[PDB]
Design a protein around this ligand. Structure first.
Ligand SMILES: [Ca+2]
Length: 154
C-alpha cells in the first residue's frame, strides 16, 4: 500500500517496447519473440497486449499508463509471483466485450498455478500465456469463443 507505486525509473530507456521485464524472467530472445507476436496481433486486430514481468513493489506501476497509452483496447499482463494468481490480466473494456471473463481465470490456472510456474519456469509460463492470449483474441465471435485455451489439444 504505497500511495500506488509510480516509477518512471523502471521504464526501459529508449523507444517504447511492449515488454518490460523488470524481474529478469525472460532472455532478450524470449522478449523479442513476444514483441513480434504482440506487434502482429496489434496489426491484425488493433488489440494491445503488453507484458510486465515484475516482483512488487519493484514495478513502474502507474508509469505504464502514459508509456503504453493504456486504453480500451489494452490488456496488461502482469506476471508477478508475489501477487495471488502469479498471472494477472488487466483487461481493457474493449477486449472485455469480445472475451468471456472465464478465459482469464482458465488461462491463469493452466499456465499460472504455482506448480506449473516452478516446474516450467517463469519464461515458459509467460510465453505460453502470451500465445494463448493471441490465439483467443484472434478468434471469430461465437458462443464458444475462447471456451478452450491454446495447448488444450495442440
Ligand atoms: Ca530480460
Amino acid at each position: 500500500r504505497p500511495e500506488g507505486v509510480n516509477r518512471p525509473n523502471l521504464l526501459p530507456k529508449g523507444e517504447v517496447t511492449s515488454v518490460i521485464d523488470v524481474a529478469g524472467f525472460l532472455t532478450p530472445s524470449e522478449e523479442k519473440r513476444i514483441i513480434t507476436e504482440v506487434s502482429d496481433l496489434e496489426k491484425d486486430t488493433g488489440f494491445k497486449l503488453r507484458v510486465l514481468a515484475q516482483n512488487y513493489p519493484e514495478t513502474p506501476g502507474l508509469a505504464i499508463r502514459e508509456y503504453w497509452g493504456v486504453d480500451d483496447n489494452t490488456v496488461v499482463f502482469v506476471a508477478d509471483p508475489t501477487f495471488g494468481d502469479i498471472l494477472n490480466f488487466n483487461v481493457g473494456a474493449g477486449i472485455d466485450l469480445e472475451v468471456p471473463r472465464s478465459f482469464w481465470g482458465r488461462l491463469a490456472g493452466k499456465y499460472g498455478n504455482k506448480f506449473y510456474w516452478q516446474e516450467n519456469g517463469e519464461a515458459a509460463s509467460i510465453l505460453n500465456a502470451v500465445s494463448a492470449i493471441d490465439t483467443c483474441l484472434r478468434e471469430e465471435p461465437g458462443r464458444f469463443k475462447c471456451s478452450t485455451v491454446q495447448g488444450d489439444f495442440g
